[PDB]
Design an enzyme around this catalytic site. Structure first.
Site, mmCIF file in Angstrom:
data_model
loop_
_atom_site.group_PDB
_atom_site.id
_atom_site.type_symbol
_atom_site.label_atom_id
_atom_site.label_comp_id
_atom_site.label_asym_id
_atom_site.label_seq_id
_atom_site.Cartn_x
_atom_site.Cartn_y
_atom_site.Cartn_z
ATOM 1 N N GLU A 53 0.926 -1.325 0.148
ATOM 2 C CA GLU A 53 -0.002 0.050 0.137
ATOM 3 C C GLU A 53 0.853 1.282 -0.066
ATOM 4 O OE1 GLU A 53 0.079 -2.752 2.007
ATOM 5 O OE2 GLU A 53 -2.033 -3.025 2.923
ATOM 6 N N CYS A 76 -2.694 -3.493 7.397
ATOM 7 C CA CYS A 76 -2.272 -3.667 8.903
ATOM 8 C C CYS A 76 -2.940 -2.281 9.614
ATOM 9 C CB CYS A 76 -0.676 -3.316 8.890
ATOM 10 S SG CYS A 76 0.199 -2.904 7.509
ATOM 11 N N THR A 159 13.873 -44.565 -5.651
ATOM 12 C CA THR A 159 14.851 -43.317 -5.540
ATOM 13 C C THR A 159 16.155 -43.654 -5.743
ATOM 14 O OG1 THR A 159 14.634 -44.012 -3.061
ATOM 15 C CG2 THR A 159 12.972 -42.047 -3.806
ATOM 16 N N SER A 166 21.720 -42.491 -7.579
ATOM 17 C CA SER A 166 20.353 -41.623 -7.648
ATOM 18 C C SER A 166 20.469 -40.511 -8.403
ATOM 19 C CB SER A 166 20.155 -41.364 -6.233
ATOM 20 O OG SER A 166 20.963 -40.625 -5.460
ATOM 21 N N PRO A 300 13.740 -41.967 2.672
ATOM 22 C CA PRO A 300 12.717 -42.935 2.985
ATOM 23 C C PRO A 300 12.388 -42.644 4.415
ATOM 24 C CG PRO A 300 14.086 -43.941 1.504
ATOM 25 C CD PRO A 300 14.875 -42.750 1.706
HETATM 26 ZN ZN LIG Z 1 0.939 -2.326 5.284
#
Ligand SMILES: [Zn+2]
Ligand SMILES: [Zn+2]
Lengths: 365, 361
Positions: A53, A76, A159, A166, A300
């Site tokens: 903002e 806020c 895997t 791997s 695992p």
């Molecule tokens: Zn703010």
């Protein structure tokens, strides 16, 4: 009614621009419209930096008077408060996707804006905004981070081969998608089993992102996610690569380590359940440290432990079109599982193609 | 008329798929005849020994076939080419040539003053009879290996408990895929362990499939049981079903079996049935496609022999663990280079499960 949707969809697009750097703050986008023309646009980028903002109000200037502000989250209301900053510019109406996740402060910002004579509405594309900060949303409501368990295996759910190789089961496109998901995550978590077995860096490599991501992520703004290593018995040594990298490393120990570690290494003490670190309490303590989301690169053993503890929020599974055999390493170790009833159950949410591989998104059903 | 030809051709391919449950060992062929922008002829092959698609569609046309354009999903062949001229046709559009006689039919029509063209939607026609096309070009049937496992690639627990890993929708989808297959193949290991029927149950099809498959037209696919050591007994269910059962034996069984049971003798390589030679013998017997319900040993043997043409994988959103039984046993595989390689072609949702279609390329 239709105009609100078009302008709002720009704010969520803007809010997503900072998803690599906003942690621990959420992603928020702001669009200011005066006479059907966008005069203010802004998104939150970094914690301690101006909010969306404020960024957009600066763009508007005097043209912010009586203007319409579209924000992906309720501004806020506590300090300067973004709600008061909007009033100081003379905005006439504000559109918010959703209220604040915190029940203590939910609705405070809209109420203070309404009291000073401002048309306020919330709810527009709420689900889309909720999906923007799933980790932050969960942490405020539950105190637990959003957990993503990554799994990469062949067609037969393997895997690694019997030899332990791997490397390059998944396509290079799949690894790279992993990097994008790593860069959006607040933290990356692993276990000492993975660290001792592969000696990984487990970092985000900016050169391995896609050109789309690289355009919206300047290299000098690279935020390395905090690395969390579960080490119940302090087996990891100060010579492993994971603590020799740039960025932070958090060690979840059950007792303090007596060695000297690099300054980037810190220690978190977690109470022990049975003879292993209490995963549930670790997540709670991580939530107190404002950790929104966790990307889990686990073997695992760690995968099964998190699943059996009911801590996994999302399964991201990469499947390669290859078959490795029945003596190749499995996916998850679930000690105790002997009957089909005790098998973990999930739900297929999203199926997408990643190069020659597929990626299955699942949630705990 | 480039786009107009496509619309009529897609109708022919749509018609041809209507007989995919009953055409074996003949291919699926669709024919559409258009005269003055109006479809006067439509036909598809339905059953072996029944009239061909051109005869099906020409009969409806009648006099309206003269000077008309015929759209056929396969090169026309009593010869369908001679039947086409006997009714009078000015133009013929064929999706593809014959896999074998290739080009003879178009030439035979061309010599009699007929405009002939081929190539329209060749890929779509190829997918219609993948088994039949492959058999004519190579002599080998198209093999579909079915896999149903959990997320971790597990088909049963350590105890053997395999009940309801996949959804009821997945079973019904399997029945549809079974019904389109020329034959269903298994091994004696599966027969001794589960005592299955391995048949197509019409009540287990979907309402869409059930609508296009009348119950009294149910064609049971030929059941093929690989029994190297003749362990299957004449009391197992697989030979108690309606339809034929072919036993791939290495030596002839000396028992008396029901009439629906026959035996194919396959040469032995080293000490094992030569699966490659069995496939050649099955192709020689005009078997177009094979749906394989296999355990880990048979699945690995087919893959290591390079005989699997298509992977159909059903995955349920469940995890079974590392002590659950695997999918395929690949003895010898130690480097990723020698691992079987495929490509995801079609991924679809079947209830809570997913179905991944893969090809060996
Ligand atoms: Zn703010
Ligand atoms: Zn014919």
């Amino acid at each position: 009614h239709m105009q609100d949707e078009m302008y709002m969809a720009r704010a969520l697009k803007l809010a997503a621009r900072g998803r690599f750097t906003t942690h621990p703050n959420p992603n928020v986008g702001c669009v200011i419209v005066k006479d059907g023309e966008i005069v203010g646009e802004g998104f939150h980028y970094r914690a301690g930096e101006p909010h969306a903002e404020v960024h957009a109000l600066r763009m508007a200037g005097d043209k912010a008077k009586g203007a319409t502000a579209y924000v992906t989250l309720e501004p806020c209301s506590h300090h300067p408060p973004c709600c008061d900053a909007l009033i100081a510019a003379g905005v006439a109406r504000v559109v918010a996707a959703m209220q604040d996740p915190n029940p203590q402060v939910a609705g405070r910002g809209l109420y203070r804006l309404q009291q000073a004579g401002i048309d306020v509405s919330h709810g527009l594309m709420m689900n889309e905004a909720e999906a923007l900060n799933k980790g932050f949303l969960k942490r405020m409501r539950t105190g637990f981070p959003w957990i993503q368990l990554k799994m990469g295996a062949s067609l037969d759910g393997r895997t690694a081969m019997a030899s332990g190789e791997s490397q390059w089961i998944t396509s290079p496109q799949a690894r790279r998608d992993v990097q994008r998901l790593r860069a959006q995550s607040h933290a990356i978590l692993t276990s000492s089993a993975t660290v001792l077995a592969d000696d990984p860096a487990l970092t985000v490599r900016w050169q391995e992102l896609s050109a789309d991501t690289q355009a919206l992520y300047p290299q000098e703004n690279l935020r390395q996610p905090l690395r969390i290593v579960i080490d119940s018995q302090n087996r990891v040594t100060p010579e492993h690569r994971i603590i020799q990298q740039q960025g932070e490393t958090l060690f979840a120990r059950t007792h303090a380590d007596e060695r000297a570690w690099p300054d980037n290494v810190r220690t978190l003490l977690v109470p022990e359940h049975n003879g292993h670190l209490d995963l549930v309490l670790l997540m709670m303590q991580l939530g107190k440290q404002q950790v929104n989301s966790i990307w889990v690169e686990a073997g695992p053993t760690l995968a099964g432990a998190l699943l059996q503890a009911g801590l996994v929020d999302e399964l991201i599974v990469y499947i390669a079109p290859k078959l490795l055999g029945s003596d190749a390493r499995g996916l998850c170790a679930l000690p105790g599982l002997e009957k089909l009833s005790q098998a973990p159950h999930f739900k297929f949410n999203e199926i997408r193609q990643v190069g020659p591989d597929v990626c299955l998104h699942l949630t705990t059903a």
